[PDB]
């Protein structure tokens, strides 16, 4: 089983509000493929059928 629990920030009754602040830049992520076009082909009636 996987808990998959998110980070928890407690809400504050007081006027001040608690904040979560990043410390490390850690730049970089993967990429996605669009698949813009499909293979272009033409059948011939005499050769096939």
């Amino acid at each position: 089983i996987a808990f998959n629990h998110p980070i928890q920030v407690d809400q504050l009754n007081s006027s001040y509000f608690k904040l979560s602040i990043p410390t490390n830049f850690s730049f970089g992520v993967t990429q996605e493929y669009i698949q813009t076009t499909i293979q272009k082909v033409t059948v011939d009636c005499k050769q096939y059928v």
């Binding site: 001040y16 904040l19 992520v29 990429q31 996605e32 493929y33 813009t36 076009t37 293979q39």
Partner: protein
């Protein structure tokens, strides 16, 4: 072309830049994306009310480390605020704080 809002159209994490390269029957990309990685919990104040209408906006950024009253940007420890918020005084609920 430019940095984009996090609608999920861009790569996961805040979008800094995207590059596109030719791929068979399609397109491929090259990228750098900001990730927070480490989170520290700091209480944030809302200005001060020493006299009349001294209350100020926390900043363009939500961050406002309590410190002595120093403003904070999105990441790292607070720095001496120097009109980063730059806000004309506004009516504020409660006293001593904008809250």
């Amino acid at each position: 072309k430019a940095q984009s809002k996090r609608s999920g159209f861009c790569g996961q994490g805040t979008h800094i830049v995207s590059f596109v390269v030719n791929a068979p029957n399609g397109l491929y990309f090259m990228h750098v994306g900001y990730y927070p990685s480490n989170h520290i919990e700091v209480v944030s104040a809302y200005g001060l009310c020493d006299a009349a209408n001294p209350t100020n906006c926390i900043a363009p950024v939500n961050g406002y480390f309590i410190k002595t009253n120093n403003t904070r940007i999105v990441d790292e420890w607070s720095y001496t605020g120097s009109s980063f918020y730059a806000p004309e005084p506004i009516t504020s609920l409660n006293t001593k704080y904008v809250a």
